[PDB]
Nucleic acid binder design. Structure first.
Lengths: 70, 149, 98, 50
RNA sequence: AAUCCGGUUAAUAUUCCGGAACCAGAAGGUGGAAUCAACACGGCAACGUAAAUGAAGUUGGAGACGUCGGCGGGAGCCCUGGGAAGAGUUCUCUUUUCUUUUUAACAAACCACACCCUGAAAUCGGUUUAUCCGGAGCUAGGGUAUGGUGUUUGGAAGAGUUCAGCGGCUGAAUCCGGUGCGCUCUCGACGGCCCUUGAAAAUCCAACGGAAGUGUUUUCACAUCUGGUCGUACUCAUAACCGCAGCAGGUCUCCAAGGUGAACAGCCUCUAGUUGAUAGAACAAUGUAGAUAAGGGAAGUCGGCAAAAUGGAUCCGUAACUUCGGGAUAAGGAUUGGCUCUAAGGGUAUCAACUUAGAACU
């Protein structure tokens, strides 16, 4: 219920203490959806390029619990 | 072997009614053993319980009759049980005609064929039911244009 | 443009039908524009190998129609019980037993 | 109905408990004059009127 | 004040589970803004902005309201053109018949009747299905406001659904469009009616006023915490209620598919539900409920009681009388099918809807 179009701020909310988990979604149309469970909202970020998605994934801090497609 | 509760659970699981639930008559013992919804779901997966398809309500004759009546058939004096106003009210006929006439009048005024004086004259003439259809207004406008010119 | 294929490997191996009858039935029962024999250059049935029935069309065409025509002669020869037409991939229909 | 009051819940809960048959070990006691419940009640025949 | 979806149970669910939200109240904290010109700027304006102090006292607004009648918009259902998956039929015919093809609360961006500005209008013009509006400033040109049951995404495909495989697991598909005097609910702009003018309060907001005042304020963006009691099964009725009963009685309301048709009529079907009511065997009288009857046609009877006849729609025609509104569907005639066709009535060359007229043929 919160769509994020800014990569950094998605990262910063991920670093924020309210963040509990992150999820990866790989759609058939080949876009990557980074969803970040927070305390109050779920912030999702849509990226159209695979390598930007991959560099984003490794940019997530290690302490965050990342989960693959459900 | 009473299976009224097994049929009830199947209808709930299959999202249908009992009239669609079909349970194998040759597997009554196995269906009787199945007593929970998890067991009923296992029966459905195994194929011992199947939801029958919906009964046939083909609209071929209905579509064919509608297409034929669209050509002008089945609309004689013996095929009309409602009065003319009930079948097609004169109110909606007038409303359609007025909206058509006003739309064309605005198109002609904006285009430049008629000025505000002629538009207002034809507007009140149309409201007075002087113009029966779009052509009737068209010939009147052309005749008025020729007379002025 | 679009290409459709009917696999009949099981039929030809079991002598259930021959690719000749497949081709003949398709050519004389294809109702393009509502009339048979109007194949023209837009739609052409190109039969390659004695296990395949391939149609190449330059206009819109229905795989459902191909299943319909295939279902026609299956009952005409009265072995519809032993054979069923099932689609595997896009534009592919193959015959399967029980 | 579905919309109840707690006092009605209490009254129904007692009346449901009183509408039960006798324990069998009761009948085996010496000098026992109880053989069946004289106060049984069916939901159709006799109403609580509460 | 504020909750939705999917799922789960032998029986509970807007309550449980999974996911996703929301409201009210409380406290300090991070970030941002204003401030020594203490209490922000912009726009001619209608008003806008992420913030932008406001005591007492006063005042305004929301809550907060009839009824009917069309007209416009939206959503759901209905209808429909292709696509794809299965399934029905196939002696013959049918590029076809049927099922499936779904997207919640909530968050975000976007989306023109009242009003403002320029302007001055009689050859008066704008405009509605419905004649209202204008020198108290029309038309026109440019703005402002309201902004959802609309749109684009997030939710969200991972779910639900259909289908094809494996021994719980793996593959696919869930797509692209049109339409309307259509129904259901709602919404907007209006209209008519009344010696009938169609609740209150709790609650919430705003304004006028200006107490008061490194430190001050902050209806701004963030996170943190919390939410008691009681009801919740099931029936709601040709068997769970009331009639002594498992009584042909009674008993408030919501949802509401297709065809015929004017129609929530009758008649038939789809989804759903039921197939319950002692049964069987025989066709006697008398019955009960329905049917038909030659010729006559009320001779029957207290009495046309009962039954019959009439019946929709279209065209024609319609009396005495009358309170001039009616009587009137007066009365009295004509007509109606199937099929093949032209002829108009619209929308943007192509596209879409059923309503009338006329021709033949049968």
């Amino acid at each position: 219920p919160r769509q994020i179009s800014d990569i950094k701020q998605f990262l910063e909310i991920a670093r924020r203490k309210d963040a509990t988990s992150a999820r990866i979604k790989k759609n058939t149309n080949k876009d990557v959806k980074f969803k970040l469970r927070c305390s109050k909202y779920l912030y999702t970020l849509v990226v159209a390029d695979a390598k930007k998605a991959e560099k984003l994934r490794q940019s997530l801090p290690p302490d965050l619990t990342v989960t693959e497609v459900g | 072997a009473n299976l009224r509760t097994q049929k009830r659970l199947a209808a709930s699981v299959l999202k249908c009614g009992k009239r669609k639930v079909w349970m194998d008559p040759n597997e009554i013992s196995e269906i009787s053993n199945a007593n929970s919804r998890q067991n009923v779901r296992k029966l459905i997966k195994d194929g011992l319980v199947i939801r029958k398809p919906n009964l046939m309500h083909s609209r071929f004759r209905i579509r064919k009759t509608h297409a034929a009546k669209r050509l002008g058939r089945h609309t004689g004096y013996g095929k009309r049980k409602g009065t003319a106003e009930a079948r097609m009210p004169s109110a909606v006929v007038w409303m359609r005609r007025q909206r058509v006439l006003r739309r064309l009048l605005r198109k002609y005024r904006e285009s430049g064929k008629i000025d505000k004086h002629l538009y207002h004259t034809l507007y009140l003439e149309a409201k007075g039911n002087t113009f029966k259809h779009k052509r009737a207004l068209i010939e009147h406008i052309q005749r008025a244009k020729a007379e002025a010119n | 443009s679009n290409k459709y294929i009917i696999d009949a490997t099981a039929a030809v191996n079991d002598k259930i039908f021959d690719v000749a009858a497949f081709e003949k039935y398709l050519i004389d029962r294809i109702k393009v524009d509502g009339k048979t024999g109007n194949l023209g250059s837009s739609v052409v049935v190109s039969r390659e190998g004695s296990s395949k029935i391939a149609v190449i069309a330059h206009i819109d065409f229905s795989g459902r129609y191909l299943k319909y025509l295939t279902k026609k002669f299956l009952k005409k020869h009265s072995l519809r019980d032993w054979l069923r037409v099932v689609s595997t991939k896009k534009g592919v229909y193959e015959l399967r037993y029980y | 109905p579905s919309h109840k009051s707690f006092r009605t819940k209490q009254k129904l809960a007692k009346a449901a408990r009183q509408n039960r048959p006798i324990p069998q070990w009761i009948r085996l006691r010496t000098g026992n004059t109880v053989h069946y419940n004289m106060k049984r009640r069916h939901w159709r025949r006799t109403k609580l009127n509460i």
